[PDB]
From a paper:
To expand the structural repertoire of determined capsid structures for the diverse Bocaparvovirus genus, viruses infecting dogs (CnMV), pigs (PBoV1), and rats (RBoV) were selected. The ORFs of these viruses coding for the major capsid protein [name] were cloned into the pFastBac1 plasmid to enable the production of the virus-like particles (VLPs), using the Bac-to-Bac expression system in insect Sf9 cells. In the icosahedral capsid, the 60 VPs assemble via two-, three-, and fivefold symmetry-related VP interactions, resulting in pores at the fivefold symmetry axes, protrusions surrounding the threefold axes, and depressions at the twofold axes.
In 2017, [name] (RBoV) was identified from brown rats in China. As a recent addition to the Bocaparvovirus genus, its pathogenicity is still unknown, but has been shown to have broad tissue tropism. Its capsid (VP1) amino acid sequence identity is 37% and 41% for BPV and HBoV1, respectively. Following cryo-EM data collection, three-dimensional-image reconstruction of the capsids, utilizing 50,866 (CnMV), 98,388 (PBoV1), and 9199 (RBoV) individual capsid images, resulted in a resolution of 2.72, 2.31, and 2.52 Å, respectively. In the case of PBoV1 and RBoV, the cryo-EM maps for the most part also showed densities for the carbonyl groups of the main-chain and densities for a specific rotamer for the individual amino acids, guiding the model building for these viruses. Capsid structures previously determined for the Bocaparvovirus genus showed disperse protrusions surrounding the threefold axis that do not significantly extend radially from the capsid surface. In contrast, the CnMV capsid shows very prominent threefold protrusions, while PBoV1 and RBoV follow the previously described characteristics of the genus. In PBoV1 and RBoV, the shorter VR-III does not cover the entire twofold region, but their loop also advances the twofold axis and restricts the size of the depression. Additionally, a different loop confirmation of VR-IX in CnMV, PBoV1, and RBoV compared to HBoV1 and BPV near the twofold axis further causes an increase in the radial capsid surface in this region. Another feature previously observed for the bocaviruses, with the exception of GBoV1, was the presence of density extending into the interior of the capsid below the fivefold channel. This density was also seen for CnMV, but is absent in the PBoV1 and RBoV capsids.
Author numbering:
A (entry chain B), B (entry chain A): 44 to 567
C (entry chain I): 259 to 310
D (entry chain I): 517 to 567
E (entry chain J): 208 to 258
F (entry chain I), G (entry chain G): 414 to 464
The structure:
């Protein structure tokens, strides 16, 4: 009833050979969002020249839970133990419980604000498990459940994309412009069946997860260098004299390999001080039936070549498609393109404060690739491949991740996709755990004039979330001891600890990395 | 439901030959602690020169129940009956019930403060039975449940130790300094599974207890003096004349004994008027890889001898390790080193007001030990042993305890420990009754700015706690009547009684002892 | 393989007073005052040792 | 071991070594141990037990 | 040698040098045979075709 | 250890040899990989704790 | 017992009372035919080893 709890606090991590189970409970707060209504959100009005986008979408009264991050499921201790004791792991399933719900009215009496509970108020809880709504979740959003278990979790508001103002507009006849505008979808969560719960009710959800592995081990040997120098190779290198070729054997310590360095792009980005085109890769969209108005009413394109339309810089900035990290097996951009978790004062350099995946010592990831030719006049020349695509006989490893990395990303729903090897370290999965949407019930109050007037309320409760992790211990024949995740290298010995104000101390002087793939060697 | 009670008031003591059962119920109050957050507590900031410590630790939002004291479980009447009718007793188990919970919001309306109950509010109750959290409980803390059953019990706030500022700091490289700082643990109770309860719920706990006995009997005969004087001993004492030894028999009333006086240290302490080094024994810690900075940034040591580091007085005071009572079988420090339960006005002497265990008449505990030698020139000389350790063939008794003594102490979790014979009278046990932690639920309220803002609430309920005591009655062949615990010797006849203001009258003129081991003789 | 971060003498809660009082010697009499909150006397004696 | 500690703990690791090439072989077949300094791999380095 | 060496602090240089494995075949169980003994081995092979 | 003399002078001295005493608790010192595993207890009538 | 002072002077003193300490092993002294067989252990809460 009203005086019975619908659950209890569940916490702690279980370790075993084949599986690890994490248990977290958070007290959460859900307010009223967006005035209980749906609104269009147009970035052209919200932005300015420093960062401009034509992004259009819908903001909703709903909010959602986000469990996607490792620091959400692992304490620094438990993350250390994962990295030290297991060669790889992946999430098998997620169980979420929402319970001990409280609905309070916010009512002002004089200057005081009084908080009384409405025992008959309800909460809307929607789970979209088949992903029929947009999936607005960017993996690096700051909306994830809090790291410390005693911190309140404010649920983020849900909003999604509709169209690009430059592409979708009223221009031309039988044009991609109108069709993008006509065909723009609208999603309202009240059109799907969902639960409504009062204080005595609770609910639960389970999600099966299929994905690739997070690999904790590193390759000490470049696959090209794994050979025995004591012996000759039968294979001979060409030597060009005049119009003929003379052959000589490769040296014992240089043996040609069948194995090609993995795909990679070393592009840092423009490095500009604005927010216009910050990513290494930007993309522009021009449907072939698109009509350019020659105004600001549409995107702008000049034809550079026959049947080629080059976007203007404003068009590139406007469509705001930013792609990164794209580096894959190239290691030069690692520090610059993977960075996160930094606030910019500009007063003090955050260069060493920022987190990035730069710390991998793996030997399958390349600085530079050189191709070698000889011209007719006898001049050898070598150039480098800065964008190197998928090619037969490539083998490589993912970059390292840390505890502040998001766990998963959603694979786009499309006909075709290539192998899912992420540069940011997420595990792409076709169906991630379904989003749990939460909304306070809309309690209307009578009004003399016609007006939308409701009762100001909010929801508080406890969310318990649990992931079962499939893991594997390592065996090695290595004689020597290996690197492990440890505090010894920290600049600041007092880290992941509390100060006298209650502040949680993380990475104040420098970013202290607790990365995967630090020490465990696998043989080629 | 909300209108049903989850228990009733349980009280009274049951006496029987082999067991005594005490039953207590208290109404308790649990507030919000520490602003619902964890904070670091550093003694260097809180203290001053009169008492300085480098003690560092964490204060928690949680609070706990403390049952450890006899006056908590025994009325003066029931304590009298234990001391008179039983030769020994020990606690077998503890049962605790928490029920009839009430959660009230504290909300200000104008100048008035209104107390309304939140029927959906919850209480967190954590039991750590395997002692995985620090066990911050000093046995003589004033935090125990109240003696009078109608007094409200305010639960104490929980806080624990992390490190010493002098030892654990950022100094040197690969030094014990950084390692102590790096390796400092942090404990958050929200990382363990625990119950959350609303007003209609209740909970219970049982703890099995294994320990040594509290002994109520005294030895009238020194084990060295138990002999029959009517007969000669065959054993002869040496008499040294020049270079030869002549032998003569021991006198009939002096017969040498095999039995050595028990271990003891007679050290009163410095007796200074400050709080710096008040105990008889102080200890200093210097890990061998410790680096002394020659500043106030670390502890300070001068090398007195080769591979010997003597701490400065400030270092001794700073690490604040105080050990007492250490006296064991030595009786001279008994009064001075066992004292407790005194408030210092300095206006009136509390010398006779203070409680201590000074009242034992037992004959196995020694004033002084003399060792006897003879030099080459024929001069006998005798010196005393002020620190006397464990030695073969020792036998002794514990000192007396009173009703204001704590029942148990926790044995440190360590590889090695010697026999558990306490100078303060507690029963050391490997696992004491697990600590019950209690916390009011954190109910957040929305705030416009980002802020941690909660609803001010508190919990009230009833705690019922029960100990089963294993006891043994005494049989004696003594002809004469024996001393018993009785009021006759009291200076103040009106004691453990109430005055017209409701004050509970205890020991105003003088400390009236109701000690164990007063009268019951055991034969050697 | 494990280490104790806490001296067994220092494991106590400073937030609260100890009932136990330290002696102060003036002339032939003893005055008592409570131990400070951060210094609480312990039952536990340092282990055996010889520094030679 | 099981711990409720929040923070990561010290572990036996090469990071503190003065000589990175240790417990390894040289070109003469010599087994390299502690030439510049004694590199300790001790017990009881990091794992806390509560009192 | 160019990558794995003793240079810098908390650098890939030292870590490659520290983390370099060493393999000794006498740390794995294996057969020892005299003149009258023999041994056999079978290996299943999965692969693509030679066309 | 702490005493006070009759004239009111507190004085403190140190215990350089400290034996087994009631209510002691301590840990062993660390070991390393070059430490011997066992030792033989002498064959005798009496022995104290093996630490 | 053997110490060395700061000025470099080694000095040795003797322990005339030596108590129970970890890792001690010893034997009882001999007896003869005129020795008593038993003694009574005092009736007390605590006693050390009976040697």
């Amino acid at each position: 009833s009203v005086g019975f709890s619908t659950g209890g606090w569940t916490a702690g991590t279980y370790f075993s050979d084949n599986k690890v189970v994490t248990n977290q409970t958070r007290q959460f707060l859900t307010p009223i969002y967006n005035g209980h209504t749906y609104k269009a959100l147009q970035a052209d009005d919200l932005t300015n020249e420093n960062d401009k986008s034509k992004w259009n979408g819908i903001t909703t009264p709903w909010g959602y839970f986000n469990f996607n991050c490792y620091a959400s499921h692992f304490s620094p201790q438990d993350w250390q133990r994962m990295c030290n004791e297991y060669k790889r792991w992946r999430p098998k399933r997620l169980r979420v419980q929402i319970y001990n719900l409280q609905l309070k009215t916010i009512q002002s009496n004089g200057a005081d604000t009084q908080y009384n509970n409405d025992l008959t108020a309800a909460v809307h809880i929607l789970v979209d498990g088949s992903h029929q709504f947009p999936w607005a979740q960017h993996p690096w959003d700051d909306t994830c459940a809090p790291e410390l278990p005693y911190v309140i979790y404010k649920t983020p508001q849900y909003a999604y994309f509709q169209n690009l103002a430059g592409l979708a507009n009223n221009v031309g006849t039988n044009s991609a412009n109108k069709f993008l505008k006509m065909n723009t979808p609208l999603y309202v969560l009240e059109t799907m069946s969902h639960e409504v719960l009062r204080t005595g009710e609770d609910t639960s959800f389970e999600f099966e997860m299929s994905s690739g592995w997070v690999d904790n081990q590193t390759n000490f040997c470049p696959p090209q260098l794994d050979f025995n120098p004591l012996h000759d190779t039968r294979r001979v290198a060409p030597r060009a004299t005049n119009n003929t070729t003379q052959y000589a054997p490769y040296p014992k310590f240089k043996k040609p390999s069948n194995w090609v360095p993995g795909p990679g792009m070393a592009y840092p980005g423009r490095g500009e001080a604005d927010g216009k085109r910050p990513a290494p890769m930007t993309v522009t969209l021009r449907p072939n039936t698109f009509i350019d108005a020659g105004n600001n009413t549409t995107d702008r394109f000049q034809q550079a070549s026959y049947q080629e339309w080059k976007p203007t810089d404003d068009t590139i900035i406007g469509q705001s498609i930013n792609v990164g990290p794209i580096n894959c097996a190239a290691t030069d951009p690692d520090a610059v393109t993977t960075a996160a978790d930094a606030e910019d004062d500009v007063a003090n350099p955050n260069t060493d404060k920022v987190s990035s995946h730069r710390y991998s010592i793996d030997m399958t990831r390349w600085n530079a690739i050189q191709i070698n030719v000889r011209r007719n006049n006898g001049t050898p020349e070598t150039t480098q491949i800065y964008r190197h695509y998928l090619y037969p006989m490539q083998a490589w490893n993912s970059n390292q991740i840390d505890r502040y990395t998001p766990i998963w990303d959603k694979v786009p729903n499309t006909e075709w996709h290539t192998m899912l090897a992420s540069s940011d370290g997420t595990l792409p999965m076709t169906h991630p755990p379904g989003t749990i949407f939460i909304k306070c019930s809309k309690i209307p109050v009578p009004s003399e004039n016609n007006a939308d007037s409701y009762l100001n309320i909010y929801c508080t409760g406890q969310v318990s979330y649990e992931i079962e992790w499939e893991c594997e211990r390592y065996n090695t024949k290595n004689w020597r001891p290996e690197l492990r995740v440890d505090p010894k290298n920290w600049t600041d010995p007092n880290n992941y600890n509390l100060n006298t104000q209650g502040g949680y101390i993380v990475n104040e002087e420098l970013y202290e990395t607790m990365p995967t793939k630090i020490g465990i060697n696998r043989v080629n």
